[PDB]
Amino acid sequence: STSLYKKAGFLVPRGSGSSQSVEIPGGGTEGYHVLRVQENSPGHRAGLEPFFDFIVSINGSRLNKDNDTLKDLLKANVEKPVKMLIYSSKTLELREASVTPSNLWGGQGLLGVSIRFCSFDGANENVWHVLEVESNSPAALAGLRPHSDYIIGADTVMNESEDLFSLIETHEAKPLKLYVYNTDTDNCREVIITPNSAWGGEGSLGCGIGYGYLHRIPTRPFE
């Protein structure tokens, strides 16, 4: 036609919009999003992968939940192996992992895993890539680092966003917490940021943001 554009095929990660929720024992679409995994933790030993793994079931019990079931089941099996059903937003697959909650490892908690109850449906898209970072910018002082860091969420209520920017204006002085994935550590951490549109530079954070296929958390070539 008159269009100066046409179509071409490109390689994209499997973790994309071909979803598909095939198929969750228990039927749900929600679970516990594995965020930070402390080192030498039970969660680490079980091979739990930050951002990519979702805890779907423990000892056969489905977690359509955000309650205290998981917490209580871990506490009741406090030094025994418990079987977990894990969903990967990377492989789009379910796998069984053995994990032994414990107080005897040197960290915090029984698994040493920071989690959040959310849906894994299209979670691999909802990523904000930190691009350039100005000196003395809010992002810099908060701990955000260029290109290595990926913003994957915040602490949010009442019913609000799935999208990042809709928070930056809300906390125009009120401090803000961010869930940040780093591609070197392959792990999540919390970042305290103080949005300031008057900080004397770019935007309210002083950093660039990438969204989309060019700005996703990297994936290995093979399962």
Binding site: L35, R36, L70, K71, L74, Q108, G109, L110, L111, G112, V113, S114, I115, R116, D155, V157, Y179, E190
Partner: peptide, 5 residues
Amino acid sequence: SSFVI
């Protein structure tokens, strides 16, 4: 919110 387990 997030919490450690």
